[PDB]
């Protein structure tokens, strides 16, 4: 027979469990929840299985502590890692501090994907995102087009939300992109913001939003992750990160050809190669099918190149490991 799709979630914490719930609600495929912690993914899997009955969907949800159970996965989504570095306060939280803790985890996961599901489409979530995806790609041996990082969909969702809220319109009808590194130097593309294709500038000219308000939204987008960390007190965002990754997974599973900003392997686009960084891309059944090369202005391109330089700096730290 043609089996149900199989989705393995490597990491069964807040984002992993939430993604599993979306899979159950949407009947996307059977789900494997893997974690190094004993019993916990098994507990969540039972709870999730009961929820599938409530939803009238048909999904097996298995919890496991064994990598062998990811065999034959169509999609693998990786959240394995730490959310907040040990001896730091909330206000000084930085994704950069997670690097030493999480890089070795990406090596281990990569080696197991190589062994058990080398044909999977792999979405990396673990921070610091752009270099974690690079470590995963290197150690997994997967094709460049079959690995990417989730960040841009989340950052863009934030930009969209804030603009849509200010304009008081449906976020379906706001198009907004944030490109570059998933960090303080991410680049919200104000010039490309549209309302059903209508340039945001028209709304400025009509006084429906001011440049000052847009500037504030741009900074709020950059700081959104830390804003939520400060408010939650424990851990970081998970509802939107989970939804973002599942949007990418759906695009793959049903060959949708979505245009989504993801951390993608560059091969000369934007003047850069051999790193992952946030760029608009077409996502379908062949993974990252196309990186779209925006006609950035020199000012936007300078911001992007500065963003890439932050990834290069992090990559030096990876090399040092």
């Amino acid at each position: 027979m043609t089996k149900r799709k199989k989705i393995s979630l490597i990491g069964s914490g807040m984002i992993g469990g939430t993604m599993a719930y979306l899979c159950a609600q949407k009947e996307l495929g059977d789900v494997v929840l893997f974690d190094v912690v004993k019993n916990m993914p098994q507990g969540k899997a039972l709870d999730l299985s009961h929820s599938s009955s409530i939803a009238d969907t048909n999904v097996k949800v298995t919890g496991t502590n064994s990598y062998e159970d990811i065999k034959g996965s169509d999609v693998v989504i990786i959240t394995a890692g730490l959310t907040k570095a040990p001896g730091k306060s909330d206000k000084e939280w930085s994704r950069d501090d997670l690097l030493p803790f999480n890089a070795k985890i990406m090596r281990e996961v990569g080696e197991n994907i190589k062994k058990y599901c080398p044909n999977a489409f792999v979405i990396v979530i673990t921070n610091p995102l752009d270099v974690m995806v690079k470590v995963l790609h290197e150690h997994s041996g997967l094709p460049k087009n079959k690995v990417c990082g989730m960040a841009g969909v989340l950052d863009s969702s934030r930009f969209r939300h804030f603009i849509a809220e200010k304009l008081n319109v449906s976020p379906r009808d706001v198009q907004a992109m944030v490109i570059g590194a998933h960090g303080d130097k991410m680049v919200p593309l104000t010039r490309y913001v549209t309302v059903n294709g209508i340039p945001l500038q028209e709304f400025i000219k009509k006084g429906r939003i001011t440049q000052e308000e847009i500037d504030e939204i741009v900074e709020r987008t950059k700081n959104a992750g830390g804003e939520i960390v400060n408010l939650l007190g424990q851990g970081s965002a998970y509802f939107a990160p989970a939804a973002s990754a599942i949007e990418m997974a759906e695009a793959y599973l049903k060959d949708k050809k979505r245009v989504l900003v993801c951390s993608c392997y560059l091969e000369g686009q934007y003047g850069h190669k051999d790193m992952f960084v946030g760029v608009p891309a077409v996502i379908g059944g062949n993974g990252v099918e196309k990186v779209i090369e925006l006609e950035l202005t020199p000012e936007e391109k300078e911001l992007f190149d500065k963003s890439v330089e932050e990834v290069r700096k992090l990559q030096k730290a990876i090399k040092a490991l």
Copy 2:
């Protein structure tokens, strides 16, 4: 006790039945299917009721030949009318030719709305769309913001589909608008076409699509209704018209603040007033909450003005029929 929403579909032919099906699938509210043909809406309503059981939804679907059954409707969607004018060939099909048959229907429907459900949001579909919505509005007494015509969502869906197909991307990520009259002088706004906010021009510059291909798509969008009429042999398009109108209805029922191109009553925007014509609008729980005035170029403005002039010419026929 808060009742289910009530949606009346005045006209139970191809578009009306198909809209009722979407209401059943989406569990939007209870449905009244009204038609002048005896028994037919009753039969469709039974079939649709059975389909709601299959969908595991909770919807009453009532077929009727009595206007009284529209009482208390939250939304009314009007498709009553002819699709093709008697004695005309398919090749010479024109929405204009439907005017003398369908205008009188709009007057009658308006009179009934005025007494039975004057607080409804009303979406007109019947052709020729922009003048039919005006007749309905005038004879119903409804506020300007509570009546509009479905056309732009359909015309835009076509423009979007053709662009998305050529670029091989999801239509979710193509934004395209067609404004003006729902007819041969509709205005597909090439300058405003975007792929997730990326200007279509960027794709031209990279040779992903040519200007010639875009020109062809613009014409194909204008001709799409007639294309389908010619292929089908019977009637006209209904799957996408139905979905378009239901998208508008959902925006109202759940106060979504969607930005949708609809035929709206103008009060000076674009330099025009007192007609309905296709413009981007924000649709929510107050109906047409805002008409958006695009910063059109002189060239686009001239295309729009010529489109409005086609509506004015049809309005002369409305006046001549004694229906103002």
Copy 3:
């Protein structure tokens, strides 16, 4: 690279188009609409393509007059045929009368499936259903588990709807089955009717529904097809037939293991073999994975045997046409 599922709809009339619409709304897979009428499926496919843009789904819909386009289909759903026999009145409508027109179509469709998509799961809808599925199976060469007919899901949806309406409860929470032939001798299984597993008898005992009312509903379920034919004036039911078949298709495509009454090839269950007839079955990625043999009472068993005998009598006509 794993391709989208491919669903071919052989027949692009009322049921075929409506199924394509559900496929577009639900994003089930790419759709091929095949028909013998030139241009019509092409026109519907355009309309449906536009509707997919509105739905924000990602579906290719292809209209065609060539069987070659069914190559590689995961699922085929067959509605090709007549709905009403020439020269007969609506009041005397009988599915039986469609047999000599539709049997030859099943043979032709089978021959094409045999060469172009022999690994498809095939759902037959064309009437008279139980013998049409047998002709298709025989001439297609497919395994017994990979062909079935849609009828029981529709007949059960009707029984469910009528019971739920009388009890004023959600049809999601009414379980009702109709087994046997898809015709006047179908068997609505009153003893098996439940409300979330609660026997219908409990509602009788409390006077929520009477035996007389249940008897009326049983007859109404049997007569439902003809009731809709009489009301509509043109054709027959399509909204619920379409939804029924798509429910079956989904069970296959996502290996759901649904318990659905379908016309299935019997191999001794109920003491019968080598015909298709309506029985509860488990539907999943291996097609008809299991026929469930109900513990029928002697009285129920006699009703079922009489239903099977109606199928046997129609099969005599199939043989006489030279179509075995």
Copy 4:
């Protein structure tokens, strides 16, 4: 205008946040997340708002520490309270130990519902469920039909899941009910289990499942809450509890007339009155529209009456407060 539905979630912990996510995914209505903890519901609300943009839905999600913000709610769902008593181990976890901690919370919530949204349909989740709903009802002054507890949908979902898993069929097609108290004396109704109306007994006779396996499933259903507690290590189930409560809320909001097992105010049915206990009911726009009185056998009725006696014992402890 006719405004969007408004759903207030009193308690913004695991179940509250999860319910909010379902509201956002399903576009059910605007959501207010209330908690006594500062900042946390505001953080979750931001995360959830970003997720609504991803989902292309149109939902306002507000976090608050002020009861005034529940004004005009169509539905209120209450999870405010403790999940596990302080000085007890996981294996000895009991919903009964939560009584002293959670009863006063129900009084406070009730008084605020009375003040700010007396016309709401109110679903109580806080344990010990059947007596917590009684305290809420008493102090809120709401009509008997406008308050109920979520338990039976969850317990029944578990029974359904386990049976469906054993039979290898879709849980949509298994009907199963658990009635009585939401506790160790809940009553899984084996005799009423059906597969699309087909009695489970037919499957026994055919050897597709044994009586021993059914007996094991009945006990597993009773112990399912504690099974998940033991596996998770922190807190209790939330994915299925959240989905169960939202199923009940949907039935109200769209007047669906669902037949759902809920903890309902009895007025003589089953020989009992003036308490809440788990019974099948019709849920629609008038709340609990009808309690369905099953034709229980004497043996089933004895189990039910014993279940009710457990509620009466808990009610004595409530009285003592």
